[PDB]
């Protein structure tokens, strides 16, 4: 067992610290831990090893020191390429077992406004005898968004699919929501609103049948 | 550079097998340990297993929630090391990472997708966004392809078979309470009149070996 702290905040160009806390009996009589940096939806990286060391191919500002139960990282200088999620892990000699810790993550401080696409059924879903509006929600921070549809002026919570943000290659946030109708529904009003809310402000797409 | 490729990912049911290959690259197969590591769908790292080299008569280790149902193999020969996973269950669904291990995880591969579930596997359907001026929020055109109605991850998306990725971005995909995925690929494009160039999405849901290439056209 290793255990870590959920979430670590920090601001940019300062130096931040995370806690890899194990026990007397594994890290305390026999110290060697490593340390890895795995960015959303990619593969996990060795920023540090043996405690102490790193590969010419890492990054200078990341580093490691330990007392005797619990091993730490340290990060100098912080950007947003840094935020990411952080794990430590250990392994005795042979008929034994890896440990990892749970996951750890660091944050930066701007702020924007989302990007806001949308599209009506295909003609071709159209003839297929379905319908779907696609909402697409782009480069926005922090993330976090409320996505609402209304069909002419009324609000639609039936057949509503939403994702939860997600950490964009940017460092800001993306998000998708599909609206699913019949093409008779579709055809039946006027207007189809896609309305994003962020910070307490509203961007709104709207689509007709044409 | 050193490459590190997994490949046979997708969907089992509960209780069947399915098992991963690894091919390696740019690193002498023969003297360097493998490893795999597993990331379940929002959790942490959690080791698999390891295989140590021929030299040292090809011993393995594994983690507890692994050990008895998954066996880890080698073939030198062929270049590549062999994931065998024989009784499964849901709590196994994860994202398998094929790594080396030296004297910690030197590297580590793209990760392949095992998602264990009774569910059947579904190819996706694929439709045209017709490009548009008024599709956006923002100042440009966009024009894109819907991919609906998959199970399970990963669909991947291109465009123009890969020569066209400037104006790309490829959203993740929502889970529907269909429980099927749906997913979408916009490009960002001067006008909604697009005359001589050509828009091709490449979807490509390897769990189903299925592949569409869909072009994309101005609405009538």
């Known amino acids: 067992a290793l255990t870590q702290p959920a979430s670590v905040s920090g601001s940019p160009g300062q130096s931040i610290t995370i806690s890899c806390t194990g026990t007397?009996?594994?890290?305390?009589?026999?110290?060697?831990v490593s340390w890895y940096q795995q960015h959303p939806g990619k593969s996990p990286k060795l920023m540090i090893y043996?405690?102490?060391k790193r590969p010419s191919g890492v990054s200078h500002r990341f580093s490691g020191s330990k007392s005797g139960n619990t091993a730490s990282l340290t990060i100098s200088g912080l950007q947003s390429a840094d935020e990411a999620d952080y794990y430590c892990?250990?392994?005795?000699?042979?008929?034994?077992?890896?440990?990892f810790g749970g996951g750890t993550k660091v944050t930066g401080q701007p702020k924007a406004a989302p990007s806001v696409t949308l599209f009506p059924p295909s003609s071709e879903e159209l003839q297929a005898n379905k319908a779907t509006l696609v909402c697409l929600i782009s480069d926005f921070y922090p993330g976090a968004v409320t996505v609402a549809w209304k069909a002419d002026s009324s609000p639609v919570k039936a057949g509503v699919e939403t994702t939860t943000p997600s950490k964009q290659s940017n460092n800001k946030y993306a998000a998708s929501s599909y609206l699913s109708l019949t093409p008779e529904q579709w055809k039946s009003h006027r207007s189809y609103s896609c309305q994003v809310t962020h910070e307490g402000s509203t961007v709104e797409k709207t689509v007709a049948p044409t | 550079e050193v490459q590190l490729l997994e490949s046979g990912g997708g969907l089992v049911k509960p209780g069947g097998s399915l098992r991963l290959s690894c091919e390696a690259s740019?690193?002498?197969?023969?003297?360097?340990?493998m490893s795999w590591v597993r990331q379940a769908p929002g959790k942490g790292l959690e080791w698999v297993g390891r295989?140590?080299?021929?030299?040292?008569?090809?011993?393995?280790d594994y983690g507890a929630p692994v050990k008895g149902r998954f066996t880890l193999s080698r073939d030198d020969s062929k270049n590549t090391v062999y994931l065998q996973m024989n009784s499964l269950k849901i709590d196994d669904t994860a994202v398998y990472y094929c790594?080396?291990?030296?004297?910690?995880?030197?590297?580590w591969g793209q990760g392949a997708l095992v998602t264990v579930s009774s569910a059947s596997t579904k190819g996706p359907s694929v439709f045209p966004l017709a490009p548009s001026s008024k599709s956006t929020s923002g100042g440009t055109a966009a024009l894109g392809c819907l991919v609906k109605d998959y199970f399970p991850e990963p669909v991947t998306v291109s465009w123009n078979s890969g020569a066209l990725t400037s104006g790309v971005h490829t959203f993740p995909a929502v889970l529907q309470s269909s429980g099927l995925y749906s997913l979408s690929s916009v490009v960002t494009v001067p006008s909604s009149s697009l005359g001589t160039q050509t828009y091709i999405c490449n979807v490509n849901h390897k769990p189903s070996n299925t592949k569409v290439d869909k072009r994309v056209e101005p609405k009538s």
């Open positions: 740019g690193l002498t197969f023969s003297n360097v340990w």
């Open positions: 007397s009996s594994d890290v305390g009589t026999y110290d060697l």
């Open positions: 892990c250990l392994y005795a000699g042979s008929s034994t077992s890896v440990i």
């Open positions: 295989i140590k080299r021929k030299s040292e008569g090809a011993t393995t």
């Open positions: 790594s080396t291990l030296t004297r910690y995880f030197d590297y």
């Open positions: 043996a405690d102490i």
